Every structure is written in structure tokens, then in C-alpha cells.
Amino acid sequence: KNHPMLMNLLK
Amino acid sequence: KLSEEQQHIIAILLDAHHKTYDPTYADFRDFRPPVRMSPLSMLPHLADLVSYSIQKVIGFAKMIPGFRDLTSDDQIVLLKSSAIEVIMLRSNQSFTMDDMSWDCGSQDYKYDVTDVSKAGHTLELIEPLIKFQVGLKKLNLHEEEHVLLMAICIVSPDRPGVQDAKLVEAIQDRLSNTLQTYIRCRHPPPGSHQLYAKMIQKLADLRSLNEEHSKQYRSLSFQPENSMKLTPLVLEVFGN
Numbered sequence: 001k002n003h004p005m006l007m008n009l010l011k
Numbered sequence: 012k013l014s015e016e017q018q019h020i021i022a023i024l025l026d027a028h029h030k031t032y033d034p035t036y037a038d039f040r041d042f043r044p045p046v047r048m049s050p051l052s053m054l055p056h057l058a059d060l061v062s063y064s065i066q067k068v069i070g071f072a073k074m075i076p077g078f079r080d081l082t083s084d085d086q087i088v089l090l091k092s093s094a095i096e097v098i099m100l101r102s103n104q105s106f107t108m109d110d111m112s113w114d115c116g117s118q119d120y121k122y123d124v125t126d127v128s129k130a131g132h133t134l135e136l137i138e139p140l141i142k143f144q145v146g147l148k149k150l151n152l153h154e155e156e157h158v159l160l161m162a163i164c165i166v167s168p169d170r171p172g173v174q175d176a177k178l179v180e181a182i183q184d185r186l187s188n189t190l191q192t193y194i195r196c197r198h199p200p201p202g203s204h205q206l207y208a209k210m211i212q213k214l215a216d217l218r219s220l221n222e223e224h225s226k227q228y229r230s231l232s233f234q235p236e237n238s239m240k241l242t243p244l245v246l247e248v249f250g251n
């Protein structure tokens with residue numbers, strides 16, 4: 001939640 | 012005693028590590044230049060180091076057998092809480108006891124106590140962090156045990172906010188058993204003595220270090236002037 005970049009790096 | 016699956020898990024984690032840790036430290040030239048004179052003069056440089064390091068830990072985490080089977084939300088929680096711990100662990104590879112500093116290729120990229128001080132941290136963290144590095148180094152882990160410890164650290168069921176802790180616990184256990192069995196077969200005595208128990212204890216030290224780091228991070232991140240010097244990723248993962 002609220003984690004755009006960490007979500008993107010996890011593919 | 013090492014099954015085929017466990018020899019596979021170790022092959023995966025070794026490769027995953029080698030693809031996410033460059034021992035030539037070539038990328039360090041991309042980070043903001045380190046300043047040694049000057050309050051928080053090392054903050055911009057080490058902030059970038061950590062931000063870079065968070066990316067690499069994520070790359071390693073994705074390749075941990077079973078990690079993918081988890082929900083994205085549990086993936087997020089595990090990384091967000093383990094990130095600083097895994098960076099402290101993986102940093103042991105550049106840490107030399109010859110002078111108690113992280114030696115990353117050159118003098119400019121060699122970091123010691125005073126450098127961390129000029130990053131905004133007190134001795135209340137720095138001393139036990141070095142103590143940790145020294146105690147971990149003296150274990151002389153096989154690189155196989157090194158990568159297993161980081162994976163086991165990342166997949167901890169007890170992290171606050173985890174949902175399917177059962178699945179997380181089943182991923183970690185399969186990793187624990189792989190480590191325990193590896194120590195028996197591949198790590199000869201006496202260096203294998205209590206080796207697993209001592210490694211798990213390091214996960215305990217990391218919990219304490221994490222707890223202390225967060226405390227000091229919030230104090231530093233409280234002043235927007237310091238928060239500016241960080242990166243968007245570091246802010247997203249370490250909290251806003």
C-alpha cells in the first residue's frame with residue numbers, strides 16, 4: 001500500500 | 012544428506028547473489044560524491060548507496076525459491092522490514108577487520124565509523140553494527156551459507172503485517188532445513204560447531220539493529236532538509 005516503486009521493482 | 016532440491020536451492024541463491032552483488036563496485040561512480048571534511052556530509056553518498064542496495068536486494072529476493080508464490084502485499088512487507096537487515100548482512104562482504112571499515116574498491120569508497128557519523132547516526136547504532144560485522148566475519152561463512160542467511164532473513168513469518176505467515180513460514184523452513192543440512196555435509200569441524208545456532212542469533216542481532224536504525228532514521232528524516240538528501244526509493248521503503 002502506497003508503494004509504487006517497490007511494487008514495480010518486484011516486477 | 013543434501014537432497015537434489017536443496018542442492019538446487021543453493022545453486023539458485025548463489026547465482027541470484029552473483030547477479031545482484033558486483034564485487035568490483037563499479038557502479039559506485041554513479042552515486043553522489045562522498046564528502047569528508049561538515050554535518051551530514053556523507054548522507055547524500057550513503058543514501059544513494061543504500062538506495063542502490065535496496066534495488067539489488069529486491070532483485071535477489073525475487074529469485075528466492077517460493078518468494079514468488081507469495082502475494083505482492085506480503086512481498087512488500089517482507090522487503091520493507093528486512094531491507095536494512097539484508098543490506099547490513101550483505102555489506103559484510105566488503106567489511107574488513109583490518110581496520111573495521113567497509114572497503115569497496117577504493118579509498119573514496121572505503122567507509123568507517125566517522126563516515127557513518129557524518130551520515131547522521133550515533134554510536135548507539137554504529138558500535139553494535141560493527142560488533143555485528145566483526146561477529147559475522149569471524150564465522151567465516153561459506154558463500155553458500157551467506158546467501159541462505161539473507162534469504163532466511165527476508166522470508167521471516169513474524170514480520171509485522173504479514174498475512175499468509177503459514178506460506179512464509181513454509182518457505183523459510185525449507186530454507187532453514189537446506190542450511191542446517193548444508194552445514195552438516197559441507198562445513199567441516201570445528202568451524203561448523205554451533206554454526207546454525209550462531210547464524211540464527213545474527214538474525215536476532217539484526218532485529219535489534221533494525222529497531223535501532225529505524226529510531227535514528229526517523230529522527231534524521233524528521234528534518235525535511237535531511238529528508239531532501241535521501242532518494243525516493245529510500246523514502247518509500249524506510250518510511251515517510
Ligand SMILES: CCC(O)(CC)CS[C@@H](C)C1=CC[C@H]2/C(=C/C=C3C[C@@H](O)C(=CCO)[C@H](O)C3)CCC[C@]12C
Pocket residue numbers: 032033036054057058060061062064098099101102103104105106113115122127130131132224228245
Ligand atoms: C545514510 C543513512 C542510512 O541510515 C539510511 C539510508 C544508512 S547509514 C548506515 C545505517 C548503514 C547501513 C549499511 C551500512 C554500509 C553498507 C555498505 C555496503 C557496501 C557493499 O558491501 C554493498 C553493495 C555492493 O554493491 C552493500 O549493499 C552496502 C556501510 C556504511 C553505512 C551503512 C550505509
